[PDB]
């Protein structure tokens, strides 16, 4: 398994491979394209992955999407691997979780104007830095904690602090938000990571591919801190339905694909069964 950084390392160590890589990069960014394709289908850049929380993930993804030829699903460039009161108490007794926790809270709970509720990009940056370098027995315990009443569900909803990040003035079109997320490098890669690990299945007994709860939970929590950042819909104790901040309105004749894209978050038996079995 060769990641794209070392694939560029072996690419820059050779003359023909670098020539065909820069040739295809000048093609994308007939006959010049097809020869570069039939050469670089044997490159170490061909089928290179990236890692979660690796150093210079952005360059790895910019290299990986550079060789990609120009669509509901895409290939993931990654390695295919009171209760909530007690979760917060287990965080605040460690030192690494406490510092970054107070970091994203003291950033995201700063009202600026009576119009601007909070700063968006710094709050997303703090949430990404929280959900990258914290051990996952702390994140999953605070974000997924089994509740029986309304106050526990409200604490669990308020954990990613949706008053700044999740909600907006309007609910835009889900397809437009998908286009915005697929414009950016990082959000498109996290969305493909979520699509590769959290589809429904008719063959496996838990409707999840490879019967892997862990990959679908990591593909869920890796979408926090982007524009396609989901959260719960209400403070329901047992009813657990996640959703991004959009809706099916404004769809036109593209209504069915919008509904099918939204049913990945609203009506996934794989993700809901994974959350329920993790709560058990």
Cβ proximity to other proteins: between 79 and 86 the closer is 79
Minimum distance of other proteins from residue 75's CB (angstroms): 4
Q: Is 173 helix (H, G, I), strand (E, B) or coil?
A: strand
CA 253 to chain centre: 28
- In degrees, rounded to 5, the angle at the alpha carbon of residue 243 between the alpha carbons of residues 238 and 247 is 130
* Token reading at 246: 């959009």
Cβ proximity to other proteins: between 66 and 276 the closer is 66
Say how many Å lie between the first and final Cα of the chain, rounded: 35
- Residue 207 Ramachandran class (φ > 0 left, ψ -120 to 50 alpha, else beta): left
Minimum distance of other proteins from residue 76's CB (angstroms): 9
Cβ proximity to other proteins: between 63 and 192 the closer is 192
Minimum distance of other proteins from residue 270's CB (angstroms): 15
Minimum distance of other proteins from residue 148's CB (angstroms): 28
Cβ proximity to other proteins: between 139 and 173 the closer is 173
Minimum distance of other proteins from residue 141's CB (angstroms): 28
Interacting residues toward other proteins by CB under 8 A: 47, 69, 73-75, 111-114, 173, 176, 202, 249-256
- Residue 55 Ramachandran class (φ > 0 left, ψ -120 to 50 alpha, else beta): beta
Cβ proximity to other proteins: between 173 and 189 the closer is 173
Cβ proximity to other proteins: between 83 and 117 the closer is 117
Q: Residue 91: CB partners within 8 Å, gap ≥ 6?
A: 97, 98, 101, 138, 142
Minimum distance of other proteins from residue 133's CB (angstroms): 28
Longest dimension (CA), the chain: 65
* Token reading at 181: 């997320």
């Amino acid at each position: 398994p060769v990641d794209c950084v070392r694939a560029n390392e072996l690419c820059a160590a050779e003359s023909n491979c670098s020539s065909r890589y820069r040739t295809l990069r000048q093609c994308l960014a007939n006959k010049e394209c097809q020869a570069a394709l039939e050469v670089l289908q044997e490159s170490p850049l061909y089928d290179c992955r990236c890692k979660r929380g690796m150093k210079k993930e952005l360059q790895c993804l910019q290299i990986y999407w550079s060789i990609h030829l120009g669509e509901f699903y895409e290939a993931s460039p990654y390695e295919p691997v009171n209760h909530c009161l007690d979760a917060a108490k287990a965080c605040n007794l460690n030192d690494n979780c406490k510092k970054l926790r107070s970091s994203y809270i003291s950033i995201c709970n700063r009202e600026i104007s009576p119009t601007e509720r909070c700063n968006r990009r710094k709050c997303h940056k703090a949430l990404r830095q929280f959900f990258d370098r914290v051990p996952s027995e702390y994140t999953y315990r605070m974000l997924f904690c089994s509740c029986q009443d309304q106050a526990c569900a409200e604490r669990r909803r308020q954990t990613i602090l949706p008053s700044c990040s999740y909600e907006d003035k309007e609910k835009p079109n889900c397809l437009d938000l998908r286009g915005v997320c697929r414009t950016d490098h990082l959000c498109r890669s996290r969305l493909a990571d979520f699509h590769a690990n959290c589809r429904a299945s008719y063959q496996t007994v838990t409707s999840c591919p490879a019967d892997n709860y862990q990959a679908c939970l990591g593909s869920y929590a890796g979408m926090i801190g982007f524009d396609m950042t989901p959260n719960y819909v209400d403070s329901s104790p047992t009813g657990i339905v996640v959703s991004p901040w959009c809706s099916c309105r404004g769809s036109g004749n593209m209504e069915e694909e919008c509904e099918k894209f939204l049913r990945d978050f609203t009506e996934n038996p794989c993700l809901r069964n994974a959350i329920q079995a993790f709560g058990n």
